[PDB]
Amino acid sequence: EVHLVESGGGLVQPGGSLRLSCEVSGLTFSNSWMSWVRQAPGKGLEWVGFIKTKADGGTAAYAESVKGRFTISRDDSKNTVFLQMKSLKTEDTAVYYCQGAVVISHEYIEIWGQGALVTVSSASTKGPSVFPLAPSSESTAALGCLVKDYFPEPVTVSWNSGSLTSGVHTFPAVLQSSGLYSLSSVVTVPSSSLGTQTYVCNVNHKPSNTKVDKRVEIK
Amino acid sequence: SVLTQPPSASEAARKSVTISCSGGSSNIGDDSVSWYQQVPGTAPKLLIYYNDRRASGVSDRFSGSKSGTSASLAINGLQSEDEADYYCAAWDDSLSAYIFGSGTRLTVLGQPKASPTVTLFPPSSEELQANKATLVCLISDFYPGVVKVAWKADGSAVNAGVETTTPSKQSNNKYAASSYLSLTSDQWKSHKSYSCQVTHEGSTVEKTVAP
């Protein structure tokens, strides 16, 4: 029922600034205590800060390591809490999660967003090239899309604009010797479906504002 | 002021485990504990709050307790879908921050051996002309999560141009990995075939493609 949808993730140069948004639907934003928690690749959870409801302090609190660099603020009319980050250090590289918490009928509710990956690196943003991978007699067939040479993470892949979900497997990225990422997504479909059915992979790399859809046809 | 948890925990299915969490007087000694569950590559999710209260929708198989500066999370009737990282948490008054414990990884013993499925795609015409020829070896549904990947060209082994991921846990708790061999367009036509071989303990699965 409740969704916290984060956006703003991507690549920023050290010393740079980046603003994350977290927009709440399904909870009354004005009554929600909003907070942020981050997680470095492969590490634990580390608290970043919170901002109180207006009826409470309306005031924010911060982890020692982000104090003075990060500012949390809220726009109640637009159901959105922000995390404004400045003077970013490579150490700040992490998935950032927002939380919304409300207290209702002696019930405490705390819901988490899906996370936004912030990559603090001197490297360049690079959009990927997408290549359809076509099948070869069997009852089902595997077809795919190769998503090659992008920076930074993540990319999402869907198929037929998200209406094809069963049999879809998107694989973790490999890091290439160039420092660029590649990944692949495959969907296994009944072979009888081929040729009366068109398949398209939808590849989104928001840090390079790249969205690419590629028809996967039987070569 | 760091909530410490044992790194790992491993108990058979249908059974029960207790995840421990020990803090100090400045956190758990002043405040309540929460417990979170995080499945690989998904957002953490609240299980327990205020020491022993279940979040809505959370199974009665979970229960929490606080005792002095220690906290505990009980998981009864263990299910394979409970494999995840469990994190305790509590507010610390002296440094005025929400502290997350170091976290315990939970393994539900009993998952059956599974041989990998292997899918091998050749370079496409599009790739060849962009000189981004890539052999794509996708490996999935194997357990336990260790494989060795070997590439061959015309029966001879190739190590140059090979990049292989570490295996990672799938939703169904089996593993996936992938391996890529990068070729010049010219190398691709310079051979009669290439093959990807995957070894998983006692079993080897090999696939071959050709121009």
């Binding site: 909003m34 609190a61 405490y108 705390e110 | -």
Partner: peptide
């Protein structure tokens, strides 16, 4: 002194 909960320190009770 107030009972608060979670990364947002929501007011729970007193």
């Amino acid at each position: 002194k107030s009972i608060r909960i979670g990364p947002g320190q929501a007011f729970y009770a007193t």
